[PDB]
């Protein structure tokens, strides 16, 4: 429900980091994080930006954050709150 502009970058980065680093007790719990990220990101590739980094893309919370930020920054969408 929280927009990119409602997150600090660190806050959003933390969400992404969870997917690489945190053990989720259930698919539901992980989905909350995945969709918090993907719904906010408005990346056309949706979950692919996390789960299907291309061979040329960094498979990391930083890569995901970059892919989200770059896409938004290039496509007229706002970034994080300071």
């Amino acid at each position: 429900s929280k927009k990119i502009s409602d997150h600090t970058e660190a806050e959003f980065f933390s969400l992404i980091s969870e997917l690489f680093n945190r053990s989720f007790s259930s698919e539901k719990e992980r989905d909350v994080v995945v969709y918090a990220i993907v719904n906010a990101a408005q990346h056309p590739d949706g979950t692919d930006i996390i789960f299907y980094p291309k061979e040329d893309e960094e498979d990391s919370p930083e890569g995901v954050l970059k892919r989200i930020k770059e896409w938004r920054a290039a496509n007229g969408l706002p970034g994080f709150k300071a």
């Binding site: 680093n21 259930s26 992980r30 498979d59 990391s60």
Partner: protein
Amino acid sequence: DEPGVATGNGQPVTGNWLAGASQGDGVPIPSQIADQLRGKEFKSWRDFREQFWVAVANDPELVKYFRKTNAKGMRDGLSPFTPKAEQAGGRDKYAIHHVVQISQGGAVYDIDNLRVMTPKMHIQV
């Protein structure tokens, strides 16, 4: 959704196991994954699904076809996300499909009754 004992051998799988998950009847359970489930007790479908994906994540030759968040989730027993193109709205995980439906006397934990499918394929059954 009751306990049971997994049975069956699945099929020899080489290369990109889930490449076929997005087509027709999906893909059989790799025999080496069947090896990790067959004869074990499962407390629930969730338990089986978790041990299934844990086994996949624990198989170097299968897990290599998953990127880090999918693999991480699978080590937690969480169904890997399919590519977005293979998702069907709310359904975004690789589905373990019962070829013979449980409602039609399909064996819940018979590995040979299981196919992995993308939601897109799964929802067409």
